Amino acid sequence: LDPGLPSTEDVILKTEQVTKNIQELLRAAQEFKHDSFVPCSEKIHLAVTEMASLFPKRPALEPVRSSLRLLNASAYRLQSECRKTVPPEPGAPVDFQLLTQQVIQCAYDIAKAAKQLVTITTREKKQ
Amino acid sequence: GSSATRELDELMASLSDFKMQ
C-alpha cells in the first residue's frame, strides 16, 4: 500500500555492502575456506536486512514485493546452508563440494534479487 | 544505478561461472 521508496543513494550504498560481502564469500569458496562461510553469511545477512529495511514493509509496486521476499528468502537459506559446514557430531563427514555449490547458488539469488531492486528503484526515481 | 547493476552483473557472472567452472 505504501509506495514510498528509499533514496537512490541509499540503495546503491546498501547494494555495495551486499555485493562486497558476497564477493568475500566467493573468494573463500575458491579458496576452500569452508570455515569462513558461516561468518561471511552473517555479514551478508546483516547487509541484506539493512537493504530490505530501506523499503516499507508491505510496500506497493508488485515487483518490489516479489524481489524483497526472494532477497529475504535467499538470505535465510544462505545462513541455513552455511551452518551445515558444522557437522552434526564432531568429525562427522560433510559434502563440501555439494554444499559449496548450494552456498554459491544461494548467493547468486541474493545478487539477482538485489539487482532487481536496484533496477526498479533507480527507474521509478526519474518518472 | 547503472554502475550498481554493472557491479551486480559482475558479481553474478563470477558466481555462476564458479558454478559452470
Side-chain angles (χ1 to χ4, degrees), chain A residues 11-56 58-101:
Chain A
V11 167
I12 310 315
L13 228 49
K14 264 40 184 193
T15 304
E16 294 180 350
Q17 187 62 63
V18 168
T19 288
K20 164 197 225 216
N21 291 324
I22 292 177
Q23 207 146 30
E24 292 162 20
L25 175 61
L26 186 51
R27 300 230 209 81
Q30 305 164 335
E31 294 177 301
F32 307 102
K33 271 195 203 296
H34 304 143
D35 57 355
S36 309
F37 291 1
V38 170
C40 296
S41 60
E42 286 174 70
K43 301 158 78 174
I44 293 161
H45 177 270
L46 181 49
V48 165
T49 296
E50 309 207 332
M51 174 178 42
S53 279
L54 288 180
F55 306 81
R58 18 167 292 175
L61 294 173
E62 192 285 324
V64 170
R65 309 190 310 263
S66 150
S67 301
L68 270 192
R69 50 178 90 99
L70 171 60
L71 177 76
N72 291 325
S74 292
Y76 177 80
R77 209 181 308 114
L78 172 69
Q79 270 204 328
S80 173
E81 278 311 279
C82 280
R83 288 192 230 108
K84 290 175 188 163
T85 66
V86 203
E89 332 79 42
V94 184
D95 187 344
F96 285 111
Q97 190 169 47
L98 180 58
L99 182 51
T100 300
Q101 295 307 321

Coordinates of all heavy atoms in Angstrom, one line a residue, chain A residues 11-101, unseen atoms left out:
Chain A
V11 N 20.1 3.1 -1.6 CA 20.0 1.7 -2.1 C 21.4 1.3 -2.7 O 21.8 0.2 -2.3 CB 19.0 1.7 -3.3 CG1 19.1 0.4 -4.0 CG2 17.6 1.8 -2.7
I12 N 21.9 2.1 -3.5 CA 23.3 1.8 -4.1 C 24.2 1.5 -2.9 O 24.9 0.5 -2.9 CB 23.8 3.0 -4.8 CG1 22.8 3.5 -5.8 CG2 25.1 2.7 -5.5 CD1 22.1 2.4 -6.6
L13 N 24.3 2.4 -2.0 CA 25.1 2.3 -0.8 C 24.9 1.0 -0.1 O 25.9 0.4 0.3 CB 24.9 3.5 0.1 CG 26.1 4.2 0.7 CD1 27.0 4.6 -0.5 CD2 25.7 5.5 1.4
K14 N 23.7 0.6 0.0 CA 23.4 -0.7 0.7 C 23.7 -1.9 -0.2 O 24.1 -3.0 0.2 CB 22.0 -0.7 1.2 CG 21.8 -0.3 2.7 CD 22.7 0.9 3.1 CE 22.6 1.2 4.6 NZ 23.2 2.5 4.9
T15 N 23.5 -1.6 -1.5 CA 23.8 -2.6 -2.5 C 25.3 -2.9 -2.6 O 25.6 -4.1 -2.6 CB 23.3 -2.1 -3.9 OG1 21.9 -1.8 -3.8 CG2 23.5 -3.2 -5.0
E16 N 26.1 -1.9 -2.5 CA 27.5 -2.1 -2.5 C 28.0 -3.0 -1.3 O 29.0 -3.6 -1.3 CB 28.2 -0.8 -2.4 CG 28.1 0.1 -3.6 CD 28.8 1.4 -3.5 OE1 29.3 1.8 -2.4 OE2 29.0 2.1 -4.5
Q17 N 27.2 -2.9 -0.2 CA 27.6 -3.6 1.0 C 27.3 -5.1 0.8 O 28.1 -5.9 1.2 CB 26.9 -3.1 2.2 CG 27.5 -3.7 3.5 CD 28.9 -3.4 3.8 OE1 29.3 -2.2 3.9 NE2 29.8 -4.4 3.8
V18 N 26.2 -5.4 0.3 CA 25.8 -6.7 0.0 C 26.8 -7.3 -1.0 O 27.3 -8.4 -0.7 CB 24.4 -6.8 -0.6 CG1 24.2 -8.2 -1.1 CG2 23.4 -6.5 0.5
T19 N 27.1 -6.6 -2.0 CA 28.0 -7.1 -3.1 C 29.4 -7.4 -2.6 O 30.0 -8.4 -2.9 CB 28.1 -6.2 -4.3 OG1 26.8 -6.2 -5.1 CG2 29.2 -6.6 -5.3
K20 N 29.8 -6.6 -1.7 CA 31.2 -6.7 -1.1 C 31.3 -8.0 -0.3 O 32.2 -8.7 -0.4 CB 31.6 -5.5 -0.3 CG 32.8 -5.8 0.6 CD 33.1 -4.8 1.8 CE 34.5 -4.5 1.8 NZ 35.0 -4.3 3.3
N21 N 30.2 -8.2 0.6 CA 30.3 -9.4 1.4 C 30.1 -10.7 0.7 O 30.8 -11.7 1.0 CB 29.2 -9.2 2.5 CG 29.4 -8.1 3.5 OD1 30.6 -7.9 3.9 ND2 28.4 -7.5 3.9
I22 N 29.3 -10.7 -0.4 CA 29.2 -11.9 -1.2 C 30.5 -12.2 -2.0 O 30.8 -13.4 -2.2 CB 28.0 -11.7 -2.2 CG1 26.7 -11.7 -1.5 CG2 28.0 -12.9 -3.3 CD1 25.5 -11.5 -2.4
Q23 N 31.1 -11.1 -2.5 CA 32.5 -11.3 -3.1 C 33.4 -12.0 -2.2 O 34.2 -12.9 -2.6 CB 33.0 -9.9 -3.5 CG 34.0 -10.0 -4.7 CD 33.9 -8.8 -5.5 OE1 33.6 -7.7 -5.1 NE2 34.1 -9.0 -6.8
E24 N 33.4 -11.6 -0.9 CA 34.3 -12.2 0.1 C 33.9 -13.7 0.3 O 34.8 -14.5 0.4 CB 34.2 -11.5 1.5 CG 34.7 -10.1 1.5 CD 34.2 -9.3 2.7 OE1 33.7 -9.9 3.7 OE2 34.2 -8.0 2.7
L25 N 32.6 -14.0 0.2 CA 32.2 -15.4 0.3 C 32.7 -16.2 -1.0 O 33.0 -17.3 -0.8 CB 30.7 -15.5 0.3 CG 30.1 -16.9 0.2 CD1 30.6 -17.6 1.4 CD2 28.6 -16.8 0.2
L26 N 32.6 -15.6 -2.1 CA 33.1 -16.2 -3.3 C 34.6 -16.7 -3.2 O 34.9 -17.8 -3.6 CB 32.9 -15.4 -4.6 CG 33.2 -16.1 -5.9 CD1 32.5 -17.4 -6.0 CD2 32.7 -15.1 -7.0
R27 N 35.4 -15.7 -2.7 CA 36.8 -16.0 -2.7 C 37.1 -17.1 -1.8 O 37.9 -18.0 -2.1 CB 37.6 -14.7 -2.2 CG 37.3 -13.5 -3.1 CD 38.6 -12.8 -3.5 NE 38.5 -11.4 -3.7 CZ 38.5 -10.5 -2.8 NH1 38.6 -10.9 -1.5 NH2 38.3 -9.2 -3.1
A28 N 36.4 -17.1 -0.6 CA 36.5 -18.2 0.3 C 36.1 -19.6 -0.3 O 36.6 -20.6 0.1 CB 35.7 -17.9 1.6
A29 N 35.1 -19.6 -1.2 CA 34.7 -20.8 -1.8 C 35.8 -21.3 -2.8 O 36.2 -22.5 -2.8 CB 33.4 -20.6 -2.6
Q30 N 36.4 -20.3 -3.5 CA 37.5 -20.6 -4.4 C 38.7 -21.1 -3.6 O 39.5 -21.9 -4.1 CB 37.9 -19.4 -5.2 CG 36.7 -18.8 -6.0 CD 37.0 -17.4 -6.4 OE1 37.8 -16.7 -5.8 NE2 36.3 -16.9 -7.5
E31 N 38.8 -20.7 -2.4 CA 40.0 -21.0 -1.5 C 39.7 -22.2 -0.6 O 40.6 -22.5 0.2 CB 40.3 -19.7 -0.6 CG 40.8 -18.5 -1.4 CD 41.0 -17.3 -0.5 OE1 40.1 -16.9 0.2 OE2 42.2 -16.8 -0.5
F32 N 38.6 -22.8 -0.7 CA 38.1 -23.8 0.2 C 38.3 -23.4 1.6 O 38.7 -24.2 2.5 CB 39.0 -25.1 -0.1 CG 38.9 -25.5 -1.6 CD1 40.0 -25.3 -2.4 CD2 37.8 -26.1 -2.1 CE1 40.0 -25.6 -3.7 CE2 37.8 -26.5 -3.4 CZ 38.9 -26.2 -4.2
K33 N 37.9 -22.2 1.9 CA 37.9 -21.7 3.3 C 36.5 -21.9 3.9 O 35.8 -20.9 4.3 CB 38.2 -20.2 3.4 CG 39.7 -19.9 3.5 CD 39.9 -18.4 3.9 CE 41.3 -17.9 3.6 NZ 42.4 -18.6 4.3
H34 N 36.1 -23.2 4.0 CA 34.7 -23.5 4.4 C 34.3 -23.0 5.8 O 33.2 -22.8 6.1 CB 34.5 -25.1 4.4 CG 34.8 -25.7 3.1 ND1 35.5 -26.9 3.0 CD2 34.6 -25.3 1.8 CE1 35.6 -27.2 1.7 NE2 35.1 -26.2 1.0
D35 N 35.4 -22.8 6.7 CA 35.2 -22.2 8.0 C 34.9 -20.7 7.9 O 34.6 -20.1 8.9 CB 36.3 -22.6 8.9 CG 37.7 -22.1 8.4 OD1 37.7 -21.6 7.2 OD2 38.7 -22.3 9.1
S36 N 35.1 -20.1 6.7 CA 34.7 -18.7 6.6 C 33.2 -18.5 6.2 O 32.7 -17.5 6.3 CB 35.6 -18.1 5.5 OG 37.0 -18.3 5.7
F37 N 32.6 -19.6 5.7 CA 31.2 -19.5 5.1 C 30.2 -19.0 6.2 O 29.4 -18.1 5.9 CB 30.7 -20.8 4.6 CG 31.4 -21.3 3.4 CD1 32.4 -20.6 2.8 CD2 30.9 -22.5 2.8 CE1 33.0 -21.1 1.6 CE2 31.5 -23.0 1.6 CZ 32.6 -22.3 1.0
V38 N 30.3 -19.5 7.4 CA 29.4 -19.0 8.4 C 29.6 -17.5 8.8 O 28.6 -16.8 8.8 CB 29.4 -19.9 9.7 CG1 28.6 -19.2 10.8 CG2 28.9 -21.3 9.4
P39 N 30.8 -17.1 9.0 CA 31.0 -15.7 9.2 C 30.6 -14.8 8.0 O 30.0 -13.7 8.2 CB 32.4 -15.5 9.7 CG 33.1 -16.7 9.3 CD 32.1 -17.8 9.4
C40 N 31.0 -15.1 6.8 CA 30.6 -14.4 5.6 C 29.0 -14.3 5.5 O 28.5 -13.3 5.2 CB 31.1 -15.2 4.4 SG 32.8 -15.2 4.1
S41 N 28.4 -15.4 5.9 CA 26.9 -15.5 5.7 C 26.3 -14.5 6.7 O 25.2 -14.1 6.5 CB 26.4 -16.9 6.0 OG 26.8 -17.3 7.3
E42 N 27.0 -14.3 7.8 CA 26.4 -13.4 8.8 C 26.5 -11.9 8.3 O 25.6 -11.1 8.6 CB 27.2 -13.5 10.1 CG 26.9 -14.8 10.9 CD 27.8 -15.0 12.1 OE1 27.7 -14.2 13.0 OE2 28.7 -15.9 12.0
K43 N 27.6 -11.6 7.7 CA 27.8 -10.3 7.1 C 26.9 -10.0 6.0 O 26.4 -8.9 5.8 CB 29.3 -10.1 6.7 CG 30.3 -10.4 7.8 CD 31.7 -10.7 7.3 CE 32.4 -9.5 6.9 NZ 33.8 -9.9 6.5
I44 N 26.6 -11.0 5.2 CA 25.7 -10.9 4.1 C 24.3 -10.7 4.6 O 23.5 -9.9 4.1 CB 25.8 -12.1 3.1 CG1 27.1 -12.2 2.4 CG2 24.6 -12.1 2.1 CD1 27.4 -13.5 1.9
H45 N 24.0 -11.5 5.6 CA 22.7 -11.4 6.2 C 22.4 -10.0 6.8 O 21.3 -9.5 6.5 CB 22.5 -12.5 7.3 CG 21.2 -12.4 8.0 ND1 20.9 -11.7 9.1 CD2 20.0 -13.0 7.7 CE1 19.7 -11.8 9.5 NE2 19.1 -12.7 8.6
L46 N 23.3 -9.5 7.5 CA 23.2 -8.1 8.0 C 22.9 -7.2 6.9 O 21.9 -6.5 6.9 CB 24.4 -7.7 8.8 CG 24.5 -6.3 9.4 CD1 23.3 -6.0 10.2 CD2 25.7 -6.2 10.3
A47 N 23.8 -7.2 5.9 CA 23.7 -6.3 4.7 C 22.4 -6.4 4.0 O 21.8 -5.4 3.6 CB 24.9 -6.6 3.8
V48 N 21.9 -7.6 3.8 CA 20.6 -7.9 3.2 C 19.5 -7.2 4.0 O 18.6 -6.6 3.5 CB 20.3 -9.4 3.1 CG1 18.9 -9.6 2.8 CG2 21.2 -10.0 2.0
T49 N 19.5 -7.5 5.3 CA 18.5 -7.0 6.2 C 18.4 -5.5 6.2 O 17.3 -4.9 6.3 CB 18.7 -7.5 7.7 OG1 18.6 -8.9 7.7 CG2 17.7 -7.0 8.6
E50 N 19.5 -4.8 6.1 CA 19.5 -3.4 6.0 C 19.0 -2.8 4.7 O 18.3 -1.8 4.7 CB 20.9 -2.8 6.3 CG 21.5 -3.4 7.5 CD 22.5 -2.5 8.1 OE1 23.2 -1.7 7.4 OE2 22.7 -2.6 9.4
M51 N 19.3 -3.5 3.6 CA 18.8 -3.1 2.4 C 17.3 -3.3 2.2 O 16.6 -2.5 1.6 CB 19.5 -3.8 1.2 CG 18.9 -3.5 -0.1 SD 19.9 -4.4 -1.3 CE 20.0 -6.0 -0.6
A52 N 16.8 -4.3 2.9 CA 15.4 -4.6 2.8 C 14.6 -3.7 3.6 O 13.4 -3.4 3.5 CB 15.1 -6.1 3.2
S53 N 15.3 -3.1 4.6 CA 14.7 -2.1 5.5 C 14.6 -0.7 5.0 O 14.0 0.2 5.6 CB 15.4 -2.2 6.9 OG 15.0 -3.3 7.6
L54 N 15.2 -0.5 3.8 CA 15.1 0.8 3.2 C 13.8 1.0 2.5 O 13.4 2.1 2.2 CB 16.2 0.9 2.1 CG 17.7 1.1 2.5 CD1 18.6 1.1 1.3 CD2 17.9 2.3 3.4
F55 N 13.0 -0.1 2.4 CA 11.7 -0.1 1.9 C 10.7 -0.3 3.0 O 11.0 -0.9 4.0 CB 11.6 -1.2 0.8 CG 12.6 -1.2 -0.2 CD1 13.9 -1.7 0.0 CD2 12.3 -0.6 -1.5 CE1 14.8 -1.7 -1.0 CE2 13.3 -0.6 -2.5 CZ 14.6 -1.1 -2.2
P56 N 9.5 0.2 2.8 CA 8.5 0.0 3.8 C 8.1 -1.5 3.8 O 8.2 -2.1 2.7 CB 7.3 0.8 3.4 CG 7.5 1.1 1.9 CD 9.0 1.1 1.7
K57 N 7.7 -2.1 4.9 CA 7.1 -3.4 4.9 C 5.8 -3.2 4.2 O 5.2 -2.2 4.2 CB 6.9 -3.9 6.4
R58 N 5.3 -4.3 3.6 CA 4.2 -4.3 2.6 C 4.2 -3.0 1.8 O 3.3 -2.2 1.8 CB 2.8 -4.4 3.3 CG 2.7 -4.1 4.8 CD 1.3 -3.9 5.3 NE 0.6 -2.7 4.8 CZ -0.6 -2.4 5.0 NH1 -1.5 -3.2 5.7 NH2 -1.1 -1.2 4.6
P59 N 5.2 -2.8 0.9 CA 5.3 -1.7 0.0 C 4.3 -1.9 -1.1 O 3.5 -2.8 -1.0 CB 6.7 -1.7 -0.4 CG 7.2 -3.1 -0.3 CD 6.4 -3.7 0.8
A60 N 4.4 -1.1 -2.2 CA 3.3 -1.1 -3.2 C 3.5 -1.7 -4.6 O 2.7 -2.5 -5.0 CB 2.8 0.3 -3.4
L61 N 4.6 -1.3 -5.3 CA 4.8 -1.9 -6.6 C 5.1 -3.4 -6.5 O 6.0 -3.8 -5.8 CB 6.0 -1.2 -7.3 CG 5.9 0.3 -7.7 CD1 7.2 0.7 -8.2 CD2 4.8 0.5 -8.7
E62 N 4.3 -4.2 -7.2 CA 4.5 -5.6 -7.1 C 5.9 -6.1 -7.3 O 6.3 -7.0 -6.6 CB 3.6 -6.3 -8.2 CG 3.5 -7.8 -8.0 CD 4.7 -8.6 -8.4 OE1 5.3 -8.2 -9.4 OE2 5.1 -9.6 -7.7
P63 N 6.6 -5.6 -8.3 CA 8.0 -6.2 -8.5 C 8.9 -5.9 -7.3 O 9.9 -6.6 -7.1 CB 8.5 -5.4 -9.8 CG 7.2 -5.0 -10.5 CD 6.3 -4.7 -9.4
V64 N 8.6 -4.8 -6.6 CA 9.4 -4.5 -5.4 C 9.1 -5.6 -4.3 O 10.0 -6.1 -3.6 CB 9.1 -3.1 -4.8 CG1 9.7 -2.9 -3.5 CG2 9.6 -2.1 -5.8
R65 N 7.8 -6.0 -4.3 CA 7.4 -7.1 -3.3 C 7.9 -8.5 -3.7 O 8.2 -9.2 -2.8 CB 5.9 -7.1 -3.2 CG 5.2 -5.8 -3.0 CD 3.7 -5.9 -2.7 NE 3.0 -6.8 -3.6 CZ 2.3 -6.3 -4.7 NH1 2.2 -5.0 -4.9 NH2 1.7 -7.2 -5.5
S66 N 7.9 -8.8 -4.9 CA 8.4 -10.1 -5.4 C 9.9 -10.2 -5.1 O 10.4 -11.2 -4.7 CB 8.2 -10.2 -6.9 OG 9.2 -11.0 -7.5
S67 N 10.6 -9.1 -5.4 CA 12.1 -9.0 -5.2 C 12.5 -9.2 -3.8 O 13.5 -9.8 -3.5 CB 12.6 -7.8 -5.8 OG 12.3 -7.6 -7.2
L68 N 11.7 -8.5 -2.9 CA 12.1 -8.5 -1.5 C 12.0 -9.9 -0.8 O 12.9 -10.2 -0.1 CB 11.2 -7.5 -0.7 CG 11.6 -6.0 -0.6 CD1 10.7 -5.4 0.4 CD2 13.1 -5.9 -0.2
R69 N 11.0 -10.6 -1.1 CA 10.9 -11.9 -0.4 C 12.1 -12.8 -1.0 O 12.8 -13.4 -0.2 CB 9.5 -12.6 -0.6 CG 9.0 -12.6 -2.1 CD 7.7 -13.4 -2.1 NE 6.5 -12.5 -2.0 CZ 5.8 -12.0 -3.0 NH1 6.1 -12.3 -4.2 NH2 4.8 -11.2 -2.7
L70 N 12.3 -12.8 -2.3 CA 13.4 -13.5 -2.9 C 14.7 -13.1 -2.3 O 15.6 -13.9 -2.1 CB 13.4 -13.4 -4.4 CG 14.7 -13.9 -5.1 CD1 14.9 -15.4 -4.9 CD2 14.6 -13.6 -6.6
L71 N 14.9 -11.8 -2.0 CA 16.1 -11.3 -1.3 C 16.1 -11.8 0.1 O 17.2 -12.4 0.5 CB 16.1 -9.8 -1.3 CG 17.3 -9.1 -0.5 CD1 18.6 -9.2 -1.4 CD2 16.9 -7.7 -0.1
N72 N 15.0 -11.7 0.8 CA 14.9 -12.2 2.2 C 15.0 -13.7 2.3 O 15.7 -14.2 3.1 CB 13.7 -11.6 2.9 CG 13.8 -10.2 3.1 OD1 14.8 -9.6 3.4 ND2 12.6 -9.5 2.9
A73 N 14.2 -14.4 1.5 CA 14.2 -15.8 1.4 C 15.7 -16.4 1.2 O 16.1 -17.3 1.8 CB 13.3 -16.4 0.3
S74 N 16.4 -15.7 0.3 CA 17.7 -16.3 -0.1 C 18.7 -16.1 1.0 O 19.6 -16.9 1.2 CB 18.1 -15.6 -1.5 OG 17.3 -16.1 -2.5
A75 N 18.6 -14.9 1.7 CA 19.5 -14.7 2.8 C 19.3 -15.7 3.9 O 20.2 -16.2 4.5 CB 19.3 -13.3 3.3
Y76 N 18.0 -16.1 4.1 CA 17.7 -17.1 5.1 C 18.2 -18.5 4.8 O 18.7 -19.2 5.6 CB 16.2 -17.1 5.3 CG 15.6 -18.2 6.3 CD1 15.7 -18.0 7.7 CD2 15.1 -19.4 5.8 CE1 15.2 -19.0 8.5 CE2 14.6 -20.4 6.7 CZ 14.7 -20.1 8.0 OH 14.2 -21.1 8.9
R77 N 18.2 -18.8 3.5 CA 18.7 -20.1 3.0 C 20.2 -20.1 3.1 O 20.8 -21.2 3.4 CB 18.2 -20.4 1.6 CG 18.0 -21.8 1.2 CD 17.6 -21.9 -0.3 NE 16.4 -21.0 -0.5 CZ 16.4 -20.0 -1.3 NH1 17.5 -19.6 -1.9 NH2 15.4 -19.2 -1.5
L78 N 20.8 -19.0 2.7 CA 22.3 -19.0 2.8 C 22.8 -19.2 4.2 O 23.7 -20.0 4.4 CB 22.8 -17.6 2.3 CG 24.3 -17.4 2.5 CD1 25.1 -18.4 1.6 CD2 24.7 -16.0 2.3
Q79 N 22.1 -18.6 5.2 CA 22.5 -18.8 6.6 C 22.4 -20.3 7.0 O 23.3 -20.9 7.5 CB 21.7 -17.9 7.5 CG 22.4 -16.6 7.8 CD 21.9 -16.0 9.1 OE1 20.8 -16.2 9.6 NE2 22.8 -15.2 9.8
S80 N 21.2 -20.9 6.6 CA 21.0 -22.2 7.0 C 22.0 -23.2 6.3 O 22.5 -24.1 7.0 CB 19.6 -22.6 6.5 OG 19.4 -24.0 6.7
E81 N 22.2 -23.0 5.1 CA 23.1 -23.9 4.3 C 24.5 -23.8 4.9 O 25.2 -24.8 5.1 CB 23.2 -23.5 2.8 CG 22.1 -24.0 1.9 CD 21.8 -25.5 2.0 OE1 22.6 -26.3 1.4 OE2 20.8 -25.9 2.7
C82 N 24.9 -22.6 5.3 CA 26.3 -22.3 5.7 C 26.6 -23.1 7.0 O 27.7 -23.6 7.2 CB 26.6 -20.9 5.8 SG 26.9 -20.1 4.2
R83 N 25.6 -23.1 7.9 CA 25.7 -23.8 9.2 C 26.0 -25.3 9.0 O 26.5 -25.9 9.9 CB 24.4 -23.6 10.0 CG 24.2 -22.3 10.6 CD 23.1 -22.2 11.6 NE 22.1 -21.2 11.3 CZ 20.9 -21.4 10.9 NH1 20.5 -22.6 10.7 NH2 20.1 -20.4 10.7
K84 N 25.7 -25.8 7.8 CA 25.9 -27.3 7.6 C 27.4 -27.6 7.4 O 27.7 -28.8 7.3 CB 25.1 -27.7 6.4 CG 23.6 -27.7 6.6 CD 22.8 -28.1 5.4 CE 21.3 -27.9 5.5 NZ 20.6 -27.9 4.2
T85 N 28.2 -26.6 7.3 CA 29.7 -26.9 7.3 C 30.1 -27.4 8.7 O 31.2 -28.0 8.9 CB 30.5 -25.6 7.0 OG1 30.4 -24.7 8.1 CG2 30.1 -24.9 5.7
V86 N 29.3 -27.1 9.7 CA 29.5 -27.6 11.0 C 28.6 -28.8 11.2 O 27.4 -28.8 11.4 CB 29.0 -26.5 12.1 CG1 29.7 -26.8 13.4 CG2 29.3 -25.1 11.6
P87 N 29.3 -30.0 11.1 CA 28.7 -31.3 11.1 C 27.9 -31.6 12.4 O 28.0 -30.9 13.4 CB 29.9 -32.3 11.0 CG 31.1 -31.5 11.5 CD 30.8 -30.1 11.1
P88 N 27.0 -32.6 12.3 CA 26.1 -33.0 13.5 C 27.0 -33.3 14.7 O 26.8 -32.5 15.7 CB 25.4 -34.2 13.0 CG 25.4 -34.1 11.5 CD 26.7 -33.4 11.1
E89 N 27.8 -34.3 14.7 CA 28.7 -34.5 15.8 C 30.1 -34.2 15.2 O 30.3 -34.2 14.0 CB 28.7 -36.0 16.2 CG 27.3 -36.7 16.0 CD 27.1 -37.1 14.6 OE1 28.1 -37.6 14.0 OE2 26.0 -36.9 14.1
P90 N 31.1 -33.9 16.1 CA 32.4 -33.7 15.7 C 33.0 -34.8 14.8 O 32.6 -36.0 15.0 CB 33.3 -33.6 17.0 CG 32.2 -33.3 18.1 CD 31.0 -34.0 17.6
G91 N 33.7 -34.4 13.8 CA 34.3 -35.4 12.9 C 33.3 -36.1 12.0 O 33.6 -37.2 11.6
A92 N 32.1 -35.6 11.9 CA 31.1 -36.2 11.0 C 31.5 -35.6 9.6 O 32.1 -34.6 9.5 CB 29.8 -35.7 11.4
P93 N 31.3 -36.4 8.6 CA 31.6 -36.0 7.2 C 30.7 -35.0 6.6 O 29.5 -35.0 6.9 CB 31.5 -37.3 6.4 CG 31.2 -38.5 7.4 CD 30.8 -37.8 8.7
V94 N 31.2 -34.1 5.8 CA 30.4 -33.1 5.1 C 30.7 -33.1 3.6 O 31.9 -33.2 3.2 CB 30.8 -31.7 5.7 CG1 29.9 -30.6 5.0 CG2 30.6 -31.7 7.2
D95 N 29.7 -33.0 2.8 CA 29.9 -33.0 1.3 C 30.1 -31.6 0.9 O 29.2 -30.8 0.5 CB 28.6 -33.6 0.6 CG 28.8 -33.7 -0.9 OD1 29.8 -33.1 -1.4 OD2 28.1 -34.4 -1.5
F96 N 31.4 -31.1 1.1 CA 31.7 -29.7 0.9 C 31.6 -29.3 -0.5 O 31.3 -28.1 -0.8 CB 33.1 -29.5 1.4 CG 33.2 -29.4 2.9 CD1 33.9 -30.4 3.6 CD2 32.6 -28.4 3.6 CE1 34.0 -30.4 5.0 CE2 32.7 -28.4 5.0 CZ 33.4 -29.4 5.7
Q97 N 31.8 -30.2 -1.4 CA 31.7 -29.8 -2.8 C 30.2 -29.5 -3.2 O 29.9 -28.6 -3.9 CB 32.3 -30.9 -3.8 CG 32.4 -30.5 -5.2 CD 33.2 -31.4 -6.0 OE1 33.0 -32.6 -6.0 NE2 34.1 -30.9 -6.8
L98 N 29.3 -30.3 -2.7 CA 27.9 -30.1 -2.9 C 27.4 -28.9 -2.1 O 26.7 -28.0 -2.7 CB 27.1 -31.3 -2.6 CG 25.6 -31.1 -2.8 CD1 25.2 -30.8 -4.2 CD2 24.8 -32.4 -2.4
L99 N 27.8 -28.8 -0.9 CA 27.4 -27.7 0.0 C 27.8 -26.4 -0.6 O 27.1 -25.4 -0.7 CB 27.9 -27.9 1.4 CG 27.5 -26.8 2.4 CD1 26.0 -26.7 2.4 CD2 28.0 -27.2 3.8
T100 N 29.1 -26.3 -1.0 CA 29.6 -25.1 -1.6 C 28.8 -24.6 -2.8 O 28.6 -23.4 -2.9 CB 31.1 -25.3 -2.0 OG1 31.8 -25.6 -0.8 CG2 31.6 -24.0 -2.6
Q101 N 28.4 -25.5 -3.7 CA 27.6 -25.2 -4.8 C 26.2 -24.6 -4.4 O 25.8 -23.6 -4.9 CB 27.4 -26.4 -5.7 CG 28.7 -26.9 -6.4 CD 29.4 -25.8 -7.1 OE1 28.8 -24.9 -7.8 NE2 30.7 -25.8 -7.1

